[PDB]
Amino acid sequence: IVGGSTIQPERVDAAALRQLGDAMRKVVGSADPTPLADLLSGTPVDPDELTREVGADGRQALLDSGMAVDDGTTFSSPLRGHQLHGVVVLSDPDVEEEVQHRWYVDPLWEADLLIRLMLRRGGARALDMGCGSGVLSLVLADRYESVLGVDVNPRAVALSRLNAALNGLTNVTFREGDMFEPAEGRFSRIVFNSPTNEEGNEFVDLLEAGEPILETFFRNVPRKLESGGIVEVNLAMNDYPGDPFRERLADWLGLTENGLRVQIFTSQRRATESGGEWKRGWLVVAPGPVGLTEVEWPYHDRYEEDPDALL
């Protein structure tokens, strides 16, 4: 029921979308919301006051793109607006798992934290695997010559395209497909906010896809990464007695065979039923001495006390 709305940025001229994006820049994320900020907060709004804020040509762009729905008396939006790290972003509202459509898009559960963890370097060509709303691609666009975002959710591809247009970003491309199959060539930068959490090995849905999605990602990383490239992954990791995640990870990447260096920064951990362990952390592949290192970095705790310990 949440996450199935039609999103059609192709039905709106890019100049009209850029203007809606500039209007969002003024009001989204600011106290004392205007009608447009009310609309993109999930509050029904009077179409006339909307029109006075975005014009008569913005109101129809809201409708043609799917950003807004005509209820007759009011306008309402299935999407919610954010402004962070120099971009405006629409995504689905944060709702419980039981009311999520199969094409529900990550409502930015961790995006703001992950952007602060990301290395601040730029480079030639970046890949956003599982791009969702497109948020990570939009931020990378400001320091990469081109960015490709990939998602198997076609609604996320459409939302990403819409968010790119709202921001007037022209060096970002999005493609529908399964993992690396639409990503041709090599990349200097690969980011993956992985759909893994509490499901262990089980595929539950596109947002909890099981460890096999990590195995496919890491097995194919070495042939997609430019030499000297950087990979950054948000992931949940399961250690089992006699079978720690890090050993499987070393096998998937071919650490020695491909000459790669990996660092795992573990932020949260808990004992599990098997006598093993669940962990959430941040994994970086970056040039340096071959092998694997794991360190404790409670960045969730630090984020909650002060978002400023970037890196």
Ligand X SMILES: Nc1ncnc2c1ncn2[C@@H]1O[C@H](CSCC[C@H](N)C(=O)O)[C@@H](O)[C@H]1O
Ligand Y SMILES: CN[C@@H]1[C@@H](O)[C@@H](O[C@@H]2[C@@H](O)[C@H](O[C@H]3O[C@H](CO)[C@@H](O)[C@H](O)[C@H]3N)[C@@H](N)C[C@H]2N)OC[C@]1(C)O
Residue number, 110 or 112, with CB nearest to ligand Y? 110
Contact 88, 25 (CB under 8 A): yes
94 binds ligand Y (CB under 6 A): yes
110 binds ligand Y (CB under 6 A): yes
Whether 301 has a binding-site annotation, put simply, is no
Residue number, 22 or 178, with CB nearest to ligand Y? 178
Residue number, 97 or 251, with CB nearest to Mg ion? 97
**Per-residue CA distances from 139 to 58, 114, 158 (Å):** 25, 11, 18
Read off the DSSP letter of residue 71. -
CA 215-216-222 angle, 5° bins:
95
* Residue 94 interaction partner, one of Mg ion, ligand Y, ligand X, none, beta carbon < 5-8 Å per kind: ligand Y
* Residue 183 interaction partner, one of ligand Y, ligand X, Mg ion, none, beta carbon < 5-8 Å per kind: none
Burial (CB count <10 Å: 0-12, 13-18, 19+), residue 90:
buried
C-alpha neighbours within 13 Å on the C-beta side of residue 84: 19
* CA–CA separation, 12 and 115 (whole Å): 29
Of 169, 231, 192, nearest to 106 by C-alpha is 192
**Per-residue CA distances from 55 to 22, 25, 51, 62, 66 (Å):** 13, 16, 5, 11, 17
Residue number, 19 or 193, with CB nearest to ligand Y? 193
106 binds ligand Y (CB under 6 A): yes
Please report how close the Cβ of residue 74 comes to ligand Y at its closest, in angstroms. 25
Segment interacting with ligand Y, rule: CB under 6 A, options 13-21, 28-36, 106-114, 245-253: 106-114
Q: How many residues bind ligand Y (CB under 6 A)?
A: 15
- Which residues make up the interface to ligand X (CB under 6 A)? 106, 108, 111, 130-133, 135-136, 150-153, 156, 178-179, 193, 195, 206-207, 209, 213
| Distance in angstroms between the alpha carbons of the first and the last residue of the chain | 39
Please report how close the Cβ of residue 96 comes to ligand Y at its closest, in angstroms. 5
Site for ligand Y in 201-230 (CB under 6 A): 207-208
Sequence ranges of the binding site for Ca(2+): 97, 205
Sequence ranges of the binding site for S-adenosyl-L-homocysteine: 151, 178-179, 193
Sequence ranges of the binding site for Mg(2+): 97, 205
